[PDB]
Design a protein around this ligand. Sequence first.
Ligand SMILES: Nc1nc2c(ncn2[C@@H]2O[C@H](CO)[C@@H](O)[C@H]2OP(=O)(O)O)c(=O)[nH]1
Ligand SMILES: Nc1nc2c(ncn2[C@@H]2O[C@H](CO)[C@@H](O)[C@H]2OP(=O)(O)O)c(=O)[nH]1
Lengths: 96, 96
Amino acid sequence: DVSGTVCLSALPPEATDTLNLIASDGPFPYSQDGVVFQNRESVLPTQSYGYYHEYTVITPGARTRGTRRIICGEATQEDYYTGDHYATFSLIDQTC
Amino acid sequence: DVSGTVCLSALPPEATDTLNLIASDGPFPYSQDGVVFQNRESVLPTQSYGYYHEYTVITPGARTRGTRRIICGEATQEDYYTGDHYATFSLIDQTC
Ligand SMILES: Nc1nc2c(ncn2[C@@H]2O[C@H](CO)[C@@H](O)[C@H]2OP(=O)(O)O)c(=O)[nH]1
Ligand SMILES: Nc1nc2c(ncn2[C@@H]2O[C@H](CO)[C@@H](O)[C@H]2OP(=O)(O)O)c(=O)[nH]1
């Protein structure tokens, strides 16, 4: 289930950077940015394989890629944020 | 993010000295010159560990290494100046 919506302005600033890269189709910092997200635990609506893609949301200070990600769906503005490595997802509201 | 491009001629003259040292591979005044800059805060573009190195820019009169540094990247002419101990960065243009 998606856990509600979150205003873009309430997320870490790096969430805004990733959306901007997603919009320009990169270039992305990591070679894993843009891989298909499988939605293997069925948290998001079931769709054909390849409908969802994931992109890193950089966590300043982490020594790795960390756990923040933006998952896009194929619908317009269908962008979900996860700060816990896919345990929970919130639909991003870009207007607040 | 990088704050913009600045002409080397517009930075303190000690920046020029540091770049000259880097071009000849030293010798450097401080033992810390040439250590890896981790880019831990993610202010500069994401790169592998060791792509960036830090060099002191002497602050006239200071008893310590102070807050000025030159960060080099592995790309041709990629050198950044920080006057606030890595809070902000500017790309150095050596052509002006
Ligand atoms: N948990 C989970 N990981 C997925 C899924 N689809 C792709 N992955 C990626 O496969 C890896 C296997 O654990 C995850 O770390 C994640 O890599 P990312 O770190 O790039 O997000 C999915 O549906 N669920
Ligand atoms: N803030 C910051 N310091 C770094 C980084 N990489 C190396 N350092 C150096 O590591 C220290 C301890 O964390 C910092 O005070 C700084 O010491 P210098 O002043 O010698 O560069 C980095 O990526 N960020």
